[PDB]
Design a protein around this ligand. Structure first.
Ligand SMILES: Cc1cc2nc3c(=O)[nH]c(=O)nc-3n(C[C@H](O)[C@H](O)[C@H](O)COP(=O)(O)OP(=O)(O)OC[C@H]3O[C@@H](n4cnc5c(N)ncnc54)[C@H](O)[C@@H]3O)c2cc1C
Ligand SMILES: C=C(O[C@H]1[C@H](O)[C@@H](CO)O[C@H](OP(=O)(O)OP(=O)(O)OC[C@H]2O[C@@H](n3ccc(=O)[nH]c3=O)[C@H](O)[C@@H]2O)[C@@H]1NC(C)=O)C(=O)O
Length: 340
């Protein structure tokens, strides 16, 4: 009944059933049985991106479909990875096998199956960069389907799986394409200190992990779901109006002229680091991250998010949108709405 070991936030709510699907047939059967009993179904990889708001009235299927296949093409390595494979382990694996291209995405928690959902990205790379396709099983029909990287409609922490393909499909495998001709992505932070000629994949790996382990909390220590909010994209004007008064605001100018702001900075500027509500708190090393500091109740996390969002809204008139999926009793609910 407890979901606590199934979500990195460490939230303790219960589910009617929790089932591990070692293969697709198991996931499908589990889904069929639950929906026949009129129950809702939630598929989880590592629950490192979900906030359970209360007891779940249905079945939670832990996707553990494992296996990796490497297909060689003259120009690149094609990996067909089971949805249940651990992402970080895959990254280390690929590097170990001399198939670089995933190092910037090192240490990101979760399963491979969940990687396309919010287009995992960090340190200059997003999964869309190395994603070839994503294979799913249409839960209600059993029909396996494949979406090319383009048909996935990848965006900043976004994909078709968060919209049109949500719930209808269960991701069972992800295909990655790693060019044989490696080219390091050294555009982000401390990575710019490295030399594109001398640098090795492993060196980028370590550089990335160093920045991560110095800023992000390990869920083993304090439960968390990473960045709690997305970095907001404001219009070029709001950015004009904001950067004048707050000149040192980290901002990332967008294609269409709009501008992304660093949410962690906005929160930090509100002196929110270390702020706690109940057992939840704003991480002192990276304010964008809310943590389960001491037996946090989900409501502690919701109210802390609300406070953070409000303070940042009053000060910068920039309204933060959660990146974490909020799971209500019958399924995902509107996070923003929940923390409004
Ligand atoms: C410490 C920490 C650091 C993080 N760093 C980063 C980062 O640098 N960049 C980044 O992008 N993200 C980051 N994250 C966010 C997180 O790792 C990603 O969202 C990740 O993809 C979640 O994987 P998961 O398997 O745990 O998904 P879950 O939390 O289990 O599920 C995510 C969502 O997708 C659904 N889903 C899960 N598996 C499947 C499937 N097979 N089929 C259908 N739906 C499925 C779930 O129902 C849910 O809606 C971080 C999280 C933590 C705790
Ligand atoms: C951890 C996650 O992803 C992380 C990802 O690892 C890093 C690096 O690529 O970039 C995002 O954080 P981020 O934008 O805050 O990355 P950061 O480099 O740490 O910092 C951005 C700017 O904010 C500043 N910053 C951040 C937190 C803070 O308390 N104070 C502060 O000033 C930084 O110094 C920096 O100049 C991700 N988030 C999103 C929501 O886009 C996650 O999604 O869960």
């Amino acid at each position: 009944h407890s979901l606590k070991p199934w979500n990195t936030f460490g939230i303790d709510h219960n589910a009617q059933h929790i089932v591990c699907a070692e293969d697709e047939q198991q996931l499908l059967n589990a889904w069929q049985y639950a929906t026949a009993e009129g129950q809702p179904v939630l598929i989880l990889g590592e629950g490192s991106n979900v906030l359970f708001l209360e007891d779940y009235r249905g079945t939670v299927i832990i996707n553990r479909i494992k296996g990796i296949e490497i297909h060689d093409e003259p120009d690149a390595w094609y990996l067909h990875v089971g949805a249940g494979e651990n992402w970080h382990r895959l990254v280390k694996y690929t590097l170990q096998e001399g198939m670089p291209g995933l190092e910037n995405l090192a240490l990101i928690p979760g399963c491979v199956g969940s990687s396309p959902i919010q287009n995992i990205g960090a340190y200059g790379v997003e999964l869309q960069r190395v994603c070839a396709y994503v294979d799913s099983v249409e839960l209600a029909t059993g029909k396996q389907v494949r979406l090319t990287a383009k048909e996935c409609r990848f965006g900043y922490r976004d994909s078709i799986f968060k919209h049109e393909y949500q719930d209808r499909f269960a991701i069972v495998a992800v295909g990655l394409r790693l060019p044989k001709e490696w080219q390091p992505v050294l555009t982000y932070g401390d990575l710019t200190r490295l030399d594109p000629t001398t640098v090795t994949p492993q060196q980028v790996f370590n550089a990335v992990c160093h920045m991560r382990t110095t800023k992000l909390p390990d869920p083993k220590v304090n439960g968390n779901a990473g960045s709690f909010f997305k970095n907001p994209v404001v219009s070029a004007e709001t950015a004009k109006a904001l950067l004048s008064q707050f000149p040192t605001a980290p901002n990332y100018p967008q294609a269409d002229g709009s501008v992304k702001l660093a949410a962690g900075w906005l929160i930090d500027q509100c002196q929110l680091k270390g702020m706690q509500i109940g057992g939840a708190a704003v991480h002192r090393q990276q304010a964008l991250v809310l943590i389960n500091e001491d037996n946090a109740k989900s409501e502690d996390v919701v109210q802390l998010a609300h406070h953070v969002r409000q303070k940042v809204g009053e000060k910068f008139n920039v309204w933060l949108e959660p990146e974490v999926r909020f799971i209500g009793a019958s399924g995902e609910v509107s996070a923003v709405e929940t923390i409004s």
